[PDB]
Design a protein around this ligand. Structure first.
Ligand SMILES: *C(=O)[C@H](CCSC)NC=O
Ligand SMILES: [Mg+2]
Ligand SMILES: [Mg+2]
Ligand SMILES: [Mg+2]
Ligand SMILES: [Mg+2]
Ligand SMILES: [Mg+2]
Ligand SMILES: [Mg+2]
Ligand SMILES: [Mg+2]
Ligand SMILES: [Mg+2]
Ligand SMILES: [Mg+2]
Ligand SMILES: [Mg+2]
Ligand SMILES: [Mg+2]
Ligand SMILES: [Mg+2]
Ligand SMILES: [Mg+2]
Ligand SMILES: [Mg+2]
Ligand SMILES: [Mg+2]
Ligand SMILES: [Mg+2]
Ligand SMILES: [Mg+2]
Ligand SMILES: [Mg+2]
Ligand SMILES: [Mg+2]
Ligand SMILES: [Mg+2]
Ligand SMILES: [Mg+2]
Ligand SMILES: [Mg+2]
Ligand SMILES: [Mg+2]
Ligand SMILES: [Mg+2]
Ligand SMILES: [Mg+2]
Ligand SMILES: [Mg+2]
Ligand SMILES: [Mg+2]
Ligand SMILES: [Mg+2]
Ligand SMILES: [Mg+2]
Ligand SMILES: [Mg+2]
Ligand SMILES: [Mg+2]
Ligand SMILES: [Mg+2]
Ligand SMILES: [Mg+2]
Ligand SMILES: [Mg+2]
Ligand SMILES: [Mg+2]
Ligand SMILES: [Mg+2]
Ligand SMILES: [Mg+2]
Ligand SMILES: [Mg+2]
Ligand SMILES: [Mg+2]
Ligand SMILES: [Mg+2]
Ligand SMILES: [Mg+2]
Ligand SMILES: [Mg+2]
Ligand SMILES: [Mg+2]
Ligand SMILES: [Mg+2]
Ligand SMILES: [Mg+2]
Ligand SMILES: [Mg+2]
Ligand SMILES: [Mg+2]
Ligand SMILES: [Mg+2]
Ligand SMILES: [Mg+2]
Ligand SMILES: [Mg+2]
Ligand SMILES: [Mg+2]
Ligand SMILES: [Mg+2]
Ligand SMILES: [Mg+2]
Ligand SMILES: [Mg+2]
Ligand SMILES: [Mg+2]
Ligand SMILES: [Mg+2]
Ligand SMILES: [Mg+2]
Ligand SMILES: [Mg+2]
Ligand SMILES: [Mg+2]
Ligand SMILES: [Mg+2]
Ligand SMILES: [Mg+2]
Ligand SMILES: [Mg+2]
Ligand SMILES: [Mg+2]
Ligand SMILES: [Mg+2]
Ligand SMILES: [Mg+2]
Ligand SMILES: [Mg+2]
Ligand SMILES: [Mg+2]
Ligand SMILES: [Mg+2]
Ligand SMILES: [Mg+2]
Ligand SMILES: [Mg+2]
Ligand SMILES: [Mg+2]
Ligand SMILES: [Mg+2]
Ligand SMILES: [Mg+2]
Ligand SMILES: [Mg+2]
Ligand SMILES: [Mg+2]
Ligand SMILES: [Mg+2]
Ligand SMILES: [Zn+2]
Lengths: 77, 48, 96, 62
RNA sequence: UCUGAUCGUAUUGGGCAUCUAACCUCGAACCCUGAAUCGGGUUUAGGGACAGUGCCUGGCGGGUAGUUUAACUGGGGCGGUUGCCUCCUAAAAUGUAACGGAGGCGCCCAAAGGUUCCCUCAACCUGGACGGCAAUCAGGUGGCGAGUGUAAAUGCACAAGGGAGCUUGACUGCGAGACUUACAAGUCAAGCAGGGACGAAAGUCGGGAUUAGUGAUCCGGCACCCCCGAGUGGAAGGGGUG
RNA sequence: UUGCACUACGAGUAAAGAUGCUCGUUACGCGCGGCAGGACGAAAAGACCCCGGGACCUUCACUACAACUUGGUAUUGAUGU
RNA sequence: UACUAAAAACACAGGUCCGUGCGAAGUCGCAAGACGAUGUAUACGGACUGACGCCUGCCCGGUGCUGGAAGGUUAAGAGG
RNA sequence: AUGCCGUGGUGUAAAGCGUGGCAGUGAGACGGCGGGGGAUAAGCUCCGUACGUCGAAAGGGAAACAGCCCAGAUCGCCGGC
RNA sequence: GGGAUGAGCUGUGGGUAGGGGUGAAAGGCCAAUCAAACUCCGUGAUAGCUGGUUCUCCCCGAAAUGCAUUUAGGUGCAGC
RNA sequence: GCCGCAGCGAAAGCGAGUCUGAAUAGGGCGACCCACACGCGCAUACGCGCGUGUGAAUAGUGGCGUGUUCUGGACCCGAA
RNA sequence: AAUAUAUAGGGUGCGGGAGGGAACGCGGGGAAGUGAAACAUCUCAGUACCCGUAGGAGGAGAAAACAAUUGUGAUUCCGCA
């Protein structure tokens, strides 16, 4: 048998994606969209983070929107 | 070629920090200002 | 645990030692001198044993939890800092 | 006879005043150069044994 | 009296030679012994501080002894594989298998980190000494087709890409609240204080556009703190922090 | 040897090869001598193959030991050079 | 190979090599003691070929065996 | 399109969650739908599916026929649909 | 059918004992058993492996997946 | 004598607190009753602080029974 | 006796020992299966077995003792720690 296990390996899935959706009350510090890069950008009361994690700075409701093409994540305080 | 060097202070000689330098690019010992918790202020730091 | 490194070998040991010469003290609060001795008077180490507030043949140590209103003259080992205050605030004393 | 306690697990767990079982945290003994100080501080101190381990850990202290 | 040479007395250690008295002889004779190729004793002939044995010590040692010699697997063997990182399979949250389809990692950087200010590329068209398809120059057109230390994905022209000045936050004491998760682990973190760096300020900075560049516990090593110190004072050892 | 018993056959169906299930076809009840196609017949908890254990054998697999062997020291002394 | 294998296998006389100088070497024994042997290198033990005839080539790098000791490395003890 | 997370109405007894005592299980199979391996072969194999059934499910139908369709046996009845 | 004056066959008495004997070598034989005999004892050896585990009714009622594993027919923890 | 009676900390030690820390910063672990009257800084009515109660609900420990677990052969039978 | 002092050995008369027993005691020798989910350190276990040797019991015993600043005052055995 031809030992064609030349490619039999994978990394671990990193559980990315959006974690708190729109119209959802968050606390101060809650991680909203964990992601690679800035697929989503920080808006009002949202910080980016070290590995582009987009947490929360102030409690409130989460709403998504557009700001010159780049789509943003903001929190109404 | 990238050893772990330690950075001691120049007043109290406490070994506060550890980092890596390159040994061929930097044959002489590094000098950096770092915070010294004994002295409570930034002092100089050479290697050992 | 089936073969893997178990819960009592993954984890590090708790830091530090156990002191071989540690002298333990038995505890009475000054808020229990008030409830057990409302008339006040002399409060010895032998009187606290018979009233059930402390064990036999051990060193007592008065601490300062609770209120004190009676006027007691208590003899003990090693009074606390906040218990010399509440005892002399009513007119008593505290001897070693 | 008489139940012997497990000598290993009693050097790694201890009890608080209410009955919680605390422990220390791994990954903080050597190879500490490449670990930043946000990681060696998260591994500092003591935490409570998790809710799923606390049956087997109790039965080894007794 | 010192460097060095030599001489002398005493003491002790190593070689070589001789001696006999420890020890050794399955060399001989005699006696216990009446019947003795055992044994012991006396005498003699040789050996001799060697050998043998005891304690310590290195070598050689399948002669012998106890045991190990991995799992996956379209039956086992042979071959290949085992952890981390990225894509697709994966059915528009997350997750998802096969010896399914592709590739990378066990680093590198004292600036390729922090900050402040400024800049816009590749390709193509026209002109130009050597100069060529393509070095350097000038002008047009060019909205991202170049570039990112390193694989791919998600990003990035507002730049995270190109350039320069000053620097060391590639910090110490911490951390509300979350992601992920059987557990052990892993990830993010506003903000407070000390002490700094850049900036006129606002402010940003707890390494690097982001996700790999790694290893639990146990047992040890070093620097510091001076916590316990087996009667006491020390010390030995142990403890904490890094 | 033996779970039973007033124990047919065909084409099917089913743990994929049916005396026992379905649809049919055939067969009066019970004995005696024969034959050996089936009852996956009887005997041996498969010797092959795999998984776990065991044994014994091998060797430049690991760790030990007997034997052989090195030196120091005791038994071990004297006089020379 | 008592109980599925009698053979081309084992033995054999013959050949060679290695060991042994004599309570030998080898073996059974912790030892004494024994066999070897009431034998002494034309003998005894170990290995491999196997009557006889013609013959038995080349390699000493590898691993053994034998001999040597210049230099390198190396234990206890002495030294402190 | 579905699925997923949040929230406001309405609906539904034997739903959800925290913490203890005691478990078993960790060999799954077929059918519908979406796919990988295989020759778009297998009663083949490996995954997805608030999909079903069997496992652990009798009763009726598919001639017979664990997994397909209808339907979930508390017991009685010589009653109806 | 092979040997049948020979390395013959045989009687009686004696010797060698288990990691040992004995073997003209087959792992043969050592009391109908031998790649390490038999008996007793340690001993009720251990077996992630197979088999078995006895009266009734009432209520509720799964799983055959994930993670790790000298792990894949075992087990810990989660799910139910 | 054991368990309850105060905990925190590596320990010295301090104690309703305590360890880390330069911290009258933050965290870890541990203590800490408003359902009502009244006084009082005084809250719109609603409560922080603080006294008398209206008289808030604490609590352990020793037997015995049951389920599971631990050391023993440990539910029973079986190797080589 | 060899051999002189003498001894080894020989003659004679008195006493004693040998062997056995179910457990217990003291001194000495000393496994393995098993447990470690393998195994070598460790365990099992100073157990089984073995040897010497008792006594009605034996061993131990009259401080080269502990303790920690006051003290206890031979040993053995049971309960705690
Ligand atoms: C192989 O077939 C054979 C088995 C006996 S017949 C089933 N192997 C060895 O004899
Ligand atoms: Mg991935
Ligand atoms: Mg980073
Ligand atoms: Mg440089
Ligand atoms: Mg492992
Ligand atoms: Mg450390
Ligand atoms: Mg650090
Ligand atoms: Mg062997
Ligand atoms: Mg296998
Ligand atoms: Mg195969
Ligand atoms: Mg998805
Ligand atoms: Mg989906
Ligand atoms: Mg590779
Ligand atoms: Mg720069
Ligand atoms: Mg830049
Ligand atoms: Mg660093
Ligand atoms: Mg935190
Ligand atoms: Mg500051
Ligand atoms: Mg300035
Ligand atoms: Mg910050
Ligand atoms: Mg990188
Ligand atoms: Mg270990
Ligand atoms: Mg001392
Ligand atoms: Mg020290
Ligand atoms: Mg610290
Ligand atoms: Mg008939
Ligand atoms: Mg038929
Ligand atoms: Mg039929
Ligand atoms: Mg019938
Ligand atoms: Mg008939
Ligand atoms: Mg017949
Ligand atoms: Mg047949
Ligand atoms: Mg049969
Ligand atoms: Mg079988
Ligand atoms: Mg050899
Ligand atoms: Mg010698
Ligand atoms: Mg010697
Ligand atoms: Mg035969
Ligand atoms: Mg024959
Ligand atoms: Mg010959
Ligand atoms: Mg000899
Ligand atoms: Mg010769
Ligand atoms: Mg030869
Ligand atoms: Mg031959
Ligand atoms: Mg040579
Ligand atoms: Mg399994
Ligand atoms: Mg499975
Ligand atoms: Mg499946
Ligand atoms: Mg199938
Ligand atoms: Mg299906
Ligand atoms: Mg399909
Ligand atoms: Mg199958
Ligand atoms: Mg059902
Ligand atoms: Mg089943
Ligand atoms: Mg049915
Ligand atoms: Mg039916
Ligand atoms: Mg029917
Ligand atoms: Mg009708
Ligand atoms: Mg004949
Ligand atoms: Mg003939
Ligand atoms: Mg004849
Ligand atoms: Mg053979
Ligand atoms: Mg026989
Ligand atoms: Mg054996
Ligand atoms: Mg036993
Ligand atoms: Mg058993
Ligand atoms: Mg039900
Ligand atoms: Mg379970
Ligand atoms: Mg404590
Ligand atoms: Mg606090
Ligand atoms: Mg009972
Ligand atoms: Mg006797
Ligand atoms: Mg053993
Ligand atoms: Mg064994
Ligand atoms: Mg074992
Ligand atoms: Mg086992
Ligand atoms: Mg006595
Ligand atoms: Zn300093």
């Amino acid at each position: 048998g031809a030992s064609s296990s030349r490619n039999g390996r994978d990394s671990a899935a990193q559980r990315l994606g959006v974690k708190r959706y729109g119209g959802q009350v968050v606390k101060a510090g809650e991680i909203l969209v964990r992601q690679r890069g800035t697929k989503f950008h920080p808006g009002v009361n949202v910080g980016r983070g070290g590995d582009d994690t987009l947490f929360a700075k102030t409690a409130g409701a989460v709403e998504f929107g557009i700001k010159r093409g780049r789509k943003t994540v903001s929190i109404v305080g | 070629v990238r050893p772990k060097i330690t950075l001691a202070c120049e007043v109290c000689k406490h070994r506060n920090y550890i980092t890596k330098k390159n040994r061929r690019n930097d044959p002489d010992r590094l000098e950096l200002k770092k915070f010294c918790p004994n002295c409570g202020k930034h002092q100089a730091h050479r290697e050992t | 645990e089936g073969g893997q490194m178990p819960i009592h070998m993954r984890l590090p040991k708790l830091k530090g030692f156990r002191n071989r010469f540690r002298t333990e003290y038995e505890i009475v609060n000054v808020g229990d001198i008030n409830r057990l001795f409302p008339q006040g008077g002399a409060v010895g180490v032998d009187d606290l044993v018979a009233k059930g507030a402390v064990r036999k043949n051990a060193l007592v140590k008065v601490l300062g939890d609770g209120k004190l209103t009676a006027k007691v003259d208590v003899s003990a080992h090693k009074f606390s800092g906040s218990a010399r205050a509440k005892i002399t605030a009513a007119g008593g004393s505290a001897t070693e | 006879p008489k139940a012997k306690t497990h000598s290993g697990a009693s050097k790694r767990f201890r009890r608080t005043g209410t009955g919680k079982i605390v422990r220390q945290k791994a990954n903080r003994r050597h190879l500490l150069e490449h670990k930043p100080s946000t990681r060696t501080r998260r591994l500092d101190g003591r935490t409570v044994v998790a809710a799923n381990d606390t049956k087997r850990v109790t039965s080894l202290l007794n």
